[PDB]
């Protein structure tokens, strides 16, 4: 026996300033392999569902994140690189391929790097003959956008419409990244202002901060149990009794 939920709500923060990513690739020119850019803005609302076709974005090889599920995720750490490489050899840029780039230039430590897009460009890189994410600028010589994520508080969320807050019933919630079902109740205070989630001995989420009103909301899913059928015998009778357990 179980209780089915009857409502779904999304509780996102009120900030709706979009990130400057529609013109990020159109701003200036992508750099060389000498230096990558990593200091980016992570105080805005991301939007990765704007352009898919007729844009300079050919390769859509993604690792750990699918491009379809990008408007219902809240991000913690956001980076964005921009560098030039030869388009004939773009297969070596992967978490697991060791070649020319994975000797002294790049090393992805099998993390959720979002999506790696190599595209095409025709319009130097100054490569040198390594720890992961360890840039070297030293002076043998010869003349992509990766969104490294960490889904494990959140400030960069997806575009979604926040609804009202409903308590005391089985309702699906989405505060930051929780997609479970439960019942919201205002109890068990003394949260300090730096701490947001709540846990217990079994490491289960029993509390969550509302991003709008900053109120303590406990999480308890609906009551369930077992169903037992008491039968006097098919040859004897036909009617039964049903015992619900622990409810």
């Amino acid at each position: 026996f179980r209780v089915q939920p009857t409502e779904s709500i999304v509780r996102f923060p009120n900030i709706t300033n979009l990130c400057p990513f529609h013109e990020v690739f159109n701003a200036t020119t992508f750099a060389s392999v000498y230096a990558w850019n990593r200091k980016r803005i992570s105080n805005c609302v991301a939007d990765y569902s704007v352009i898919y076709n007729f844009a300079p974005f050919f390769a859509f090889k993604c690792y750990g994140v699918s491009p379809t599920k990008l408007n219902d995720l809240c991000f913690t750490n956001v980076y964005a690189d921009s560098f030039v490489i030869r388009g004939n050899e773009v297969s070596q840029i992967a978490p697991g391929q060791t070649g020319n780039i994975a000797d002294y230039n790049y090393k992805l430590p099998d993390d959720f790097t979002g999506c790696v897009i190599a595209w095409n460009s025709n319009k130097n890189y100054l490569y040198r003959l390594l720890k992961p994410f360890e840039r070297d600028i030293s002076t043998p010589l010869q003349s992509v956008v990766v969104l490294s994520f960490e889904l494990l508080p959140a400030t960069v969320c997806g575009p979604k419409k926040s609804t009202n807050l409903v308590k005391n019933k089985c309702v699906n919630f989405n505060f930051n990244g929780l997609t479970g079902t439960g019942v919201l109740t205002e109890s068990n205070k003394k949260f300090l202002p730096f701490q947001q989630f709540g846990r217990d001995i079994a490491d289960t989420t029993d509390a969550v901060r509302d991003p709008q009103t900053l109120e303590i909301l406990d999480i308890t899913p609906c009551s369930f149990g077992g169903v037992s059928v008491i039968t006097p015998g098919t040859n004897t009778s036909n009617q039964v009794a049903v015992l619900y357990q622990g409810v």
Partner: protein, 235 residues
């Protein structure tokens, strides 16, 4: 001058931002050990992060500066504790041999170059003030617990709550204190602890799993008390 003294199982902060009930959670992070040869001062290396503790009657000593080589190498950090706010300046600064910072001066080294951060918020102070600077972002922890002691660092436990989280990615090797003072500097090491949370959710006790065999068998079974017997801990 310079003198040597001993800590009293202090210098423990909050690892994460997750509420926990009366449970015995064992973490693993860069922590100061319980009994270590801390150094009292009256170009320090950074290592894995420092533990700054200074007691002052009327807030005489204030300010910090971080860098590798200064001048024009890997920028610098400048924390100034003004009476109304706290100014964080991350630029490229030259010289700055001695601080020697109306009656006082309002300049240390000047020679500003570009701009990276300007974090202005509420002031830290308003003794036994403790600060933990751990570096890849930049974590700053603090705790203001007044005490009554001659040489400070008393008995008991005091958990350090996080205050400042700067998203600056840079290495720091040298640590210097800006501006007759008295301060202590400890060094952080990778250790494993067993933090105890109360009903209110603040850390009231911890043990170190690298000091004593009793303090090692306190960590294998999650219990502060130990029954009489023989326990197999490690190999």
């Amino acid at each position: 001058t310079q003198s040597y003294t001993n800590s009293f199982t202090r210098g423990v902060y909050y690892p994460d931002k997750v509420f926990r009930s009366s449970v015995l959670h064992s973490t693993q992070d860069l922590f100061l050990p319980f009994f270590s040869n801390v150094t009292w001062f009256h170009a320090l290396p950074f290592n894995d992060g420092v533990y700054f503790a200074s007691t002052e009657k009327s807030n005489i000593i204030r300010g910090w500066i971080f860098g590798t080589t200064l001048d024009s190498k890997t920028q610098s950090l400048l924390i100034v504790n003004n009476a109304t706010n706290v100014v964080i300046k991350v630029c490229e600064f030259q010289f700055c041999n001695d601080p020697f910072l109306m009656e006082s001066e309002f300049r240390v080294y000047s020679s500003a170059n570009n701009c990276t951060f300007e974090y202005v918020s509420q002031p830290f102070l308003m003794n036994l003030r403790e600060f933990v600077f751990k570096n890849g972002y930049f974590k700053i922890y603090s705790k203001h617990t007044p005490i009554n002691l001659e040489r400070d660092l008393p008995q008991g436990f005091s958990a350090l709550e996080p205050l400042v989280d700067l998203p600056i990615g840079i290495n720091i090797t040298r640590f210097q204190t800006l501006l007759a003072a008295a301060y202590y500097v400890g060094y952080l090491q990778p250790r494993t602890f067993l933090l105890k949370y109360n009903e209110n959710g603040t850390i009231t006790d911890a043990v170190d799993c690298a000091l004593d065999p009793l303090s090692e068998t306190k960590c294998t079974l999650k219990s502060f008390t130990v029954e009489k017997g023989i326990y197999q801990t490690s190999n």
